[PDB]
Automatic annotation (TrEMBL), chain A:
Protein name as catalogued: Capsid protein VP1
Chief location of this protein within or outside the cell: host cell
Organism: Norovirus Hu/GII/JP/2015/GII.P17_GII.17/Kawasaki308
UniProt entry tagged with the keyword Cytoplasm: no
Keyword Magnesium in record: no
Signal peptide stretch: none
Domain of life: Viruses
Boundaries of every Calicivirus coat protein C-terminal domain copy: 82-308
TrEMBL record, chain B:
Region of the whole protein represented: 225 to 530 of 540
Keywords, ordered alphabetically: Host cytoplasm, Virion
Listed name of the protein: Capsid protein VP1
Signal sequence range: none
Location of this chain's protein in the cell: Host cytoplasm; Virion
Protein's UniProt keywords contain Ligase: no
Superkingdom, taxonomy of origin: Viruses
Broad class of where this protein is predominantly found: host cell
Gene Ontology CC: host cell cytoplasm; virion component
Domain Calicivirus coat protein C-terminal span(s) in chain numbering: 81-307
Length: 308, 307
C-alpha cells in the first residue's frame, strides 16, 4: 500500500540550484570524472531523506549565521562562531559534515555580511558590507564551529550577531582556483571529512550523470561561474514533503513537452538522488522552455536507457 | 476534488514571500487605516499567483537585465529589465511590474554583478555593492527600467547585469522604509495597475496574522520588519496542488506535533491571507516545532476561538 512517487511540475526557469542560491540555467551531461562527484548540498534520497549539509531553504545555501567573536592578524581576519542557520546553537557532535548550508566546494564565496547588535552595547544598531569566505582557508573550520571572513572595512565591524549572504563565487587571486567538485576540509587541515553524502557515479555502460547547471555571479576575471547540482532544490523540498517509498533503486523519468505530450528523452533517477542518461561526451542539452521531467515507472539496474 | 493541504514546515523552514530570508516569527496586527496591499507573496488557495508574485525565492526583490546608460543623478545607472529568467520583458503584460519587483517604499541594498557578452572582453566579470531606491523617479520597473546607485562608478559597464538583494533601509535623505506603501511602478504622475487587491479582516474581532522576518539593515536602528501574508513555500505548494477551494475560508490549526495539541486556530481565506481572533498588536510566542494544518472548509462568518 505504497504512496506514489512523483516530481513537482516545474520548468527549468522555475527551478533553483540546490548548491548555490540562483535559478537553474540549463541541463548538462558530463563525461565521467576520474574522481567521483560527492557534493554535500543538494543531496536527498527519493524517499525524502536529506543528506550531507543539505537543508530546505534556498536562502540557506552557502549562508552563515552566528556571532563574530574575535579577530586575528591574517587575511582571513574575522572569526565567526557559527550557529545553525535558524539561530539555534550549533553542536559539533551532530552527525553532519558541517553546519547545514555550508559551501561544498573549494573557492571563494563573495557576498555581504550584516550585523544587528544585541545586549548592552547599542542594541538594535546595524551595519552591512562586502565580505568573502575562502573555503581553502585554514580557518575555514565550519564543522568545528567557525569560519573566518575577509571584509572591506575593518573599522566598521563589531563583536555582534552576524549573517553572511552569498552572492557569487570566484577563484582566489593567488593560485587557489574555484573547483566545484573538490570538497573543503570542514574541520581544517589534517582532519578527514565525516558523515558525508556518498559519492555518485553511473553504474551502467554508456551512461553519464545529468546535471542542473547554473552560471553564477563572479567578482572579477573570466570564470564562467559554473555550479552543477544533482537535483534542484524544489525536488528536494518535494521529496521531503512526500516521503514516498522507493520501490526500486532506479526510477525511470521522462522529459516531456506538455503541449505536444511527447517524451523528448528518458533518464534514470537513482534512489540516492541523482540522474543518469545514456550519452557519451560533454553536452549542453537543448530542450524547449516548457519542458519538464515526469516520473514514469520503477525500473532497475538491468534497464537500458534509450540513447539521449 | 483534490483535498486541500498545507506543506508541513516549521517557521524556520519557511521563506518570506516578500524578501529572500527565512521567517522569524508570527505577528498579529491591530486593525487600522493601514491598508495592506502587498504585491509579492500573493496567491490564491487553489494556486493562482497574483500581483508581482513568482515562484523562485531567489527572485524576490531581484532584478535582471542590461545596464545601458548613466545619468548625472544619484540614481545613476540605467538598467533595462528582463524577466528574471532572462526572457524579454513585455510592459503591456497584465502585471503591476516585472515579477519579483520590490513592493515597498525604501532602499534595497545588495550587490550588482556583470558578465560581458559580445565584442567587449566577453566573459569578463565584476561585482560590487549597489542600492535600488524605490522612491526614485527612475524607479519605473513597469515601463522596463530601474536606476542603480553603486559604490565604484569606475568599474561598471554597459553589459548584462544582475541585482542580488541583501537587505533594506531608510534612505539617507530621510525617505523612510515603509513596507505597506507601494512604489509607483511607472514613476511620477502614474497610477499603478493590475494590482492584487487590498487585504483586510471582514469579521468583528479578527486581525490579520503575518509571517514576520527581521531582515538585514545597512546602518541605523531599523528593525528590518517585513511581514508577508503566506510564506513562499505555501505559494509553491498551492501552485503545484491547485486544489479546489470548497468555500471562502479554510479553517487551519497551529499544532504542536510533539504533543498533538492545537495551540490556536485561524482562518485561511481563499484569496491567500490569514486572520485570527485577537485584539491588539501581538508577537506570537509559540514552540519551534509548531506548524499549521488544514482542518476544514467554513464560511466567512465562522467564529474563531480567541487566541
Ligand atoms: C576582467 C576584469 O576583472 C576585474 O578586475 C580584475 C583585474 O583586471 C584587469 C586586468 O588584469 C587587465 O588586463 C585589464 O584588462 O584591466 C582589468 C581591470 O582593471 O585584475 C585584478 C588583478 O590583476 C583583479 O583580479 C580584478 O578583480 C573587474 O574589476 C574588471 O571590470 C574586469 O572585468
Ligand atoms: C547605528 C550606526 O549605524 C551605522 O552608522 C551610521 C552613523 O550613525 C551615527 C548616528 O547617526 C549618531 O547620531 C550616533 O549614533 O553615532 C552614529 C555613528 O557615530 O551615522 C552616519 C550619519 O552620517 C550614517 O548614517 C551611518 O550609517 C553603522 O555604520 C554603525 O556601525 C552603527 O551601527
Ligand atoms: Mg511526476
Ligand atoms: Mg495540511
Amino acid at each position: 500500500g505504497s504512496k506514489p512517487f512523483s516530481l513537482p511540475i516545474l520548468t527549468l526557469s522555475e527551478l533553483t540550484n540546490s548548491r548555490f542560491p540562483v535559478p537553474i540555467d540549463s541541463l548538462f551531461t558530463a563525461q565521467n570524472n576520474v574522481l567521483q562527484v560527492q557534493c554535500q548540498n543538494g543531496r536527498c534520497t527519493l524517499d525524502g531523506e536529506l543528506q550531507g549539509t543539505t537543508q530546505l531553504l534556498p536562502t540557506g545555501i552557502c549562508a552563515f549565521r552566528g556571532r563574530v567573536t574575535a579577530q586575528i592578524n591574517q587575511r582571513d581576519r574575522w572569526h565567526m562562531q557559527l550557529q545553525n542557520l535558524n539561530g539555534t546553537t550549533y553542536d559539533p557532535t551532530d552527525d553532519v559534515p558541517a553546519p547545514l548550508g555550508t559551501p561544498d566546494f573549494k573557492g571563494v564565496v563573495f557576498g555581504m555580511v550584516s550585523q544587528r547588535n544585541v545586549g548592552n552595547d547599542a542594541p538594535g544598531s546595524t551595519r552591512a558590507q562586502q565580505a568573502w569566505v575562502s573555503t581553502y582557508s585554514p580557518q575555514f573550520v565550519p564543522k568545528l564551529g567557525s569560519v573566518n571572513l575577509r571584509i572591506s572595512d575593518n573599522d566598521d565591524f563589531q563583536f555582534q550577531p552576524t549573517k553572511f549572504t552569498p552572492v557569487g563565487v570566484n577563484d582566489d587571486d593567488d593560485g587557489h582556483p574555484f573547483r566545484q567538485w573538490e570538497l573543503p576540509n570542514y574541520s581544517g587541515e589534517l582532519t578527514l571529512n565525516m558523515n558525508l553524502a556518498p559519492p555518485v557515479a553511473p553504474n551502467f555502460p554508456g551512461e553519464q550523470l545529468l546535471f542542473f547547471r547554473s552560471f553564477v555571479p563572479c567578482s572579477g576575471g573570466y570564470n564562467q561561474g559554473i555550479i552543477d547540482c544533482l537535483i534542484p532544490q524544489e525536488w528536494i523540498q518535494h521529496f521531503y514533503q512526500e516521503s514516498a517509498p522507493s520501490q526500486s533503486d532506479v526510477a525511470l523519468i521522462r522529459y516531456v513537452n506538455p503541449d505536444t505530450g511527447r517524451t523528448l528523452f528518458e533518464a534514470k533517477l537513482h534512489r540516492s538522488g541523482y540522474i543518469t542518461v545514456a550519452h557519451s561526451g560533454d553536452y549542453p542539452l537543448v530542450v524547449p522552455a516548457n519542458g519538464h521531467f515526469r516520473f514514469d515507472s520503477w525500473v532497475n539496474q538491468f534497464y537500458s536507457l534509450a540513447p539521449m
